[PDB]
């Protein structure tokens, strides 16, 4: 049926979203956490 | 038998042990420190910076942008709702 | 502002990626078979 | 230390410090962050001691 | 219509959300805003008192 438009595309989407998240956004939260820890310590 | 000399031996080690580590940690960040909001960069224009400043700023931080996005997606989807059914 | 930090994407998350590849391959194989059209 | 107090009196961005400025000032925090990222130990020992969670859980 | 009544009820849902959930989330966020600012200023005060 009409399956070769959203499943493999969706897999590419969640792969790139996982990459972007883990490489960009989590590091900002980690950086703010460690900065608050450092200037608090 | 003689007089040993303590009171001028602080040259080799600064007084205190625990705050010595914090001295270098807290003395270095004061040089490149913003006096009062230096370089705020509150003004920008890249066809989307105005929207970020007006709505996506921390001053308001309300749910209005989400409702505006919902209204926009409804307006966009009305046309293809007519097209399909 | 925005910087790239190299967290492990394959050293630790390989099973999920290989499972996704296998699922995609199975879907492609069964598209001409498990469709009944 | 008079220079330190004089700077701290009117150059203390408590609510307006840039994280990029913090990273540029001290590369040691950057080194620590990449080292712990590549090590896989995402924990930062001693982080819930002073910072709350407001956890709905 | 088959879908317009949903559009009519969306406004009421948004109104109730803003009436009930929005003030609660606003207070919850601002409480930790003040908490973080105060604890950060207190840590800085402790550090400057130690250096003094």
Distances (CA, A) of C20 to A7, A26, C17, C27: 10, 23, 5, 10
Q: Tell me, in Å, the resolution of the deposited structure.
A: 3.5
State whether residue D12 sits within 8 Å of chain E by CB.
yes
Chain E residues in contact with B61 (beta carbon < 8 A): 29
Q: How many angstroms separate the CA atoms of A40 and A31, rounded?
A: 14
Q: How many angstroms separate the CA atoms of D15 and B77, rounded?
A: 42
First to last CA, chain A: 60
Q: How many angstroms separate the CA atoms of D41 and C32, rounded?
A: 45
Which residue in D36, E10, C5 sits closest to B66, CA to CA?
E10
What is the sign, positive or negative, of the torsion defined by CA atoms of D35, D39, D45, D48? positive
Q: How many angstroms separate the CA atoms of E16 and E9, rounded?
A: 11
Contact C12 D20 (CB under 8 A): no
Method: cryo-EM
Helix (H), strand (E), coil (C) string for chain B:
CCCCCCCCCCCCCCCCCHHHHHHHHHHCCCCCCCCCCCCCCCCCCCCCHHHHHHCCCCCCCCCHHHHHHHHHHHHHHHHHHHHHC
The partner residue sitting opposite A8, judged by closest CB among C4, C6, C24, is: C24
Q: How many angstroms separate the CA atoms of B80 and B85, rounded?
A: 8
In terms of Cβ atoms closer than 10 Å to its own Cβ (0-12, 13-18, 19+), residue A37 is: middle
Locate the chain D residue with the closest alpha carbon to C13. Answer: D40
Chain E residues in contact with D11 (beta carbon < 8 A): none
Which residue in B33, A22, B71, A5 sits closest to E11, CA to CA?
B71
Does residue D41 come out as left (phi exceeding 0), alpha (psi in the -120 to 50 range) or beta? Answer: beta
């Amino acid at each position: 049926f009409y399956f070769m438009n959203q499943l493999t595309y969706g897999f590419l989407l969640m792969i790139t979203l996982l990459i972007l998240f883990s490489q960009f956004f989590l590091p900002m939260i980690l950086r703010l956490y460690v900065s608050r820890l450092f200037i608090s310590k | 038998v003689s007089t040993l000399i303590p009171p001028k031996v602080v040259s080799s080690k600064n007084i205190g042990s625990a705050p010595n580590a914090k001295r270098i940690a807290n003395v270095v960040h004061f040089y490149k420190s913003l006096p009062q909001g230096p370089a705020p960069a509150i003004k920008a224009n890249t066809r989307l910076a105005r929207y970020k400043a007006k709505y996506f700023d921390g001053d308001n931080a309300s749910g209005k942008p989400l409702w505006h996005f919902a209204l926009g997606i409804i307006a966009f989807g009305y046309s293809m709702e007519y097209y399909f059914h | 502002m925005l910087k790239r930090f190299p967290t492990p994407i394959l050293k630790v998350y390989w099973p999920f990626f290989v499972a996704g590849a296998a699922v995609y391959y199975g879907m492609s194989k069964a598209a001409d078979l498990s469709s009944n059209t | 230390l008079q220079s330190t107090l004089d700077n701290i009196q009117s150059a203390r961005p408590f609510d307006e410090l840039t994280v990029d400025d913090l990273t540029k000032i001290k590369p040691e925090i950057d080194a620590k962050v990449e080292e712990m990222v590549k090590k896989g130990k995402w924990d930062v020992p001693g982080y819930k001691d002073r910072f709350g969670n407001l956890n709905v859980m | 219509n088959d879908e317009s009544i949903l559009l009519l009820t969306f406004l009421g849902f948004t109104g109730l959300v803003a009436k009930y959930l929005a003030p609660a989330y606003k207070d919850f966020a601002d409480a930790r805003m003040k908490k973080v600012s105060d604890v950060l200023n207190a840590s800085r005060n402790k550090h400057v008192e130690a250096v003094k």
